[PDB]
């Protein structure tokens, strides 16, 4: 009779629960994008997580999108970051880096030399972007040139062999919510006409490659993936998800990944008939360790964790405001409201001073 608070082998790590902190963009980064010392603190005082994963953090320079995202390319960011390890190493937690290229979700006032963001297809997204001198419509990003994919794949390789010196425990590949591999994915994103568009087989190619390249810096079984399937997040739909999906799932399986994480948009039933993409449907298909996120509670992480449907649950929201989730849920103790304002950006309010129960 598993449940949320049974330990699990991932590899030769020892979860002590099955509960992960889900990666969290909070945009506290210091000059250069560098991580400090509160963030340590942070990612220290949820060192209960059977697992944490650390924010979407850009392997490259023109990979940032957001003001203040910490990176993984210079070594004043594995610095900082060895800061954040080090913390969560001597709390007796387990921590992977998610690596990070937003692609078309960007603006030049964020790119080196004021340069287009890069993207599969020259298609803008809706709407506008944060830069540091405020809101700006988004322009168009520059299709990459099919001879600039093993660039691409080559930063995701540094982004993950500077995680290994920065003492992470393994790394997660972004792959989902919009950002440049998904958009790749995505036929709505990727209108190519070389190998990285067009079949399944050509969109899925550039995810491929990166987790060949990494997998061949850490043990694969330190190596996960996050998709997103039914996500409309920064204007990224697939037309077809359920075979694009269920063709990632079936097509990882032979790098013997660590895990397969699928975060479940919140709105996936009520915005079809009903979901287009079960997880089910993923599960079947992905034969190794499953996370699942996705307005996950005790109740709905027992259950999944008890019929079998996932290994791990992830929990972003509840983990902002509840450094010690793992004790409160444990316990059925009251939760801490998550304050929406303090998400993004600014200091320890709203990011160190959550109470413990
Ligand atoms: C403030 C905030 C920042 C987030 N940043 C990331 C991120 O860096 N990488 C990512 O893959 N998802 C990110 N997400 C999505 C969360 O990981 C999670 O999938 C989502 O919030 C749904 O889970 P929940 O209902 O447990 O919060 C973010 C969500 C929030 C609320």
Redesign the pocket.
């Known amino acids: 009779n598993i449940n949320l608070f049974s330990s699990y082998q991932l590899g030769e790590l020892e979860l002590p629960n099955r509960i992960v902190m889900?990666?969290?963009?909070?945009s506290r980064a210091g000059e250069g994008n560098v991580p400090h010392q509160l963030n340590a603190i942070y990612y220290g005082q949820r060192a209960s997580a059977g697992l944490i994963i650390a924010?979407?953090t850009q392997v490259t320079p023109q990979g940032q999108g957001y003001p203040h995202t910490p990176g993984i390319h210079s070594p004043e960011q594995v610095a900082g970051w060895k800061l954040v390890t080090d913390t969560v190493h001597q709390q007796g937690g387990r921590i992977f880096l998610?690596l990070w290229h937003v692609g078309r979700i960007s603006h030049p006032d964020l790119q080196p030399d004021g340069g287009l963001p890069v993207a599969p297809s020259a298609i803008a997204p809706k709407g506008e972007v944060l830069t540091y001198e405020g809101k700006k419509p988004y322009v168009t990003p520059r299709a990459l040139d099919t001879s600039e994919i093993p660039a691409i794949v080559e930063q995701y390789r540094q982004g993950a062999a500077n995680a290994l010196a920065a003492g992470f425990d393994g790394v997660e590949i972004?792959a989902?919510?919009g950002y440049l591999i998904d958009q790749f994915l995505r036929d709505g994103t990727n209108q190519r006409t070389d190998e990285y568009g067009g079949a399944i087989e050509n969109r899925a190619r550039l995810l491929l490659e990166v987790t060949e390249a990494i997998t061949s810096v850490w043990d694969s079984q330190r190596v996960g993936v996050?998709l997103s399937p039914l996500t409309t997040l920064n204007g990224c739909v697939d037309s077809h998800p359920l075979e694009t999906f269920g063709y990632v799932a079936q097509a990882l399986n032979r790098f013997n990944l660590s895990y397969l994480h699928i975060?479940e948009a919140?709105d996936a039933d009520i915005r079809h008939g009903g979901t287009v993409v079960p997880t089910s449907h993923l599960r079947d298909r992905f034969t190794g360790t499953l996370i699942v996120?996705?307005?996950?509670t005790r109740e709905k992480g027992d259950t999944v964790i008890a019929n079998k449907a996932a290994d791990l649950v992830?929990?972003?929201?509840?983990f902002?405001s509840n450094p010690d989730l793992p004790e409160r849920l444990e316990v059925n103790a009251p939760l801490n409201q998550a304050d929406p304002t303090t998400?993004?950006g600014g200091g320890e309010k709203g990011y160190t001073d959550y109470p413990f129960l």
Do not use: S
Request: aromatic content about 20%; overall charge positive.
């Open positions: 889900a990666p969290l963009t909070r924010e979407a998610q972004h989902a919510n996050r975060f919140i996120n996705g307005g996950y992830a929990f972003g929201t509840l902002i998400f993004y």
